[PDB]
Write a protein that binds this DNA or RNA. Structure first.
Length: 160
RNA sequence: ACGGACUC
């Protein structure tokens, strides 16, 4: 029933302060409301990883809160550039997400109204096996795409 | 730096 595989996001360092909040208040609320364990590295592109461990539903809820917080802060500081959702996933667990001929990926794109691209295999390194899944859309469409992407990642984890 | 946090 529990899947040990966390959701891992890549977010711009600029927005981590809003995610965590003064004295941890914001992230404290998220982890309480979504019953999740969320890890942000203090030192670590000017992007930082966030690891979210929870049920599928609590994981999607925490991701959606982080996307909402980040979009608000971008508006607050007149940050005009798009902020795609970026999911990290081990190379061993992406073939099911993509599917024969990209079929599964394109279906998620059409179902969620996002544009999803995966980093090229040859950008991996010996000791970084994580591909970057970039999801372009609104807060709402990106959150739905996260739900569908991680279903496929977990399906591969739990079988493959 | 709005850096919070629950083990194995």
């Amino acid at each position: 029933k529990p899947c040990d595989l966390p959701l891992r996001l890549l977010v711009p360092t600029q927005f981590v302060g809003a995610i965590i909040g003064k004295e941890g208040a914001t992230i404290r609320n998220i982890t309480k409301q979504t019953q999740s364990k969320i890890d942000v590295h203090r030192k670590e592109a000017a992007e930082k990883s966030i690891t979210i461990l929870s049920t599928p539903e609590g994981t999607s809820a925490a991701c959606k809160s982080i996307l909402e917080i980040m979009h608000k802060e971008a508006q607050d500081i007149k940050f005009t550039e798009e902020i795609p959702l970026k999911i990290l996933a081990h190379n061993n667990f992406v073939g099911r997400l993509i599917g024969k001929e990209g079929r599964n990926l394109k279906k998620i794109e059409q179902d969620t109204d996002t544009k999803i691209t995966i980093s090229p295999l040859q950008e991996l390194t010996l000791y970084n096996p994580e591909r970057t899944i970039t999801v372009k859309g609104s807060v709402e469409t990106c959150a739905k795409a996260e739900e569908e992407i991680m279903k496929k990642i977990r399906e591969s984890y739990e079988n493959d």
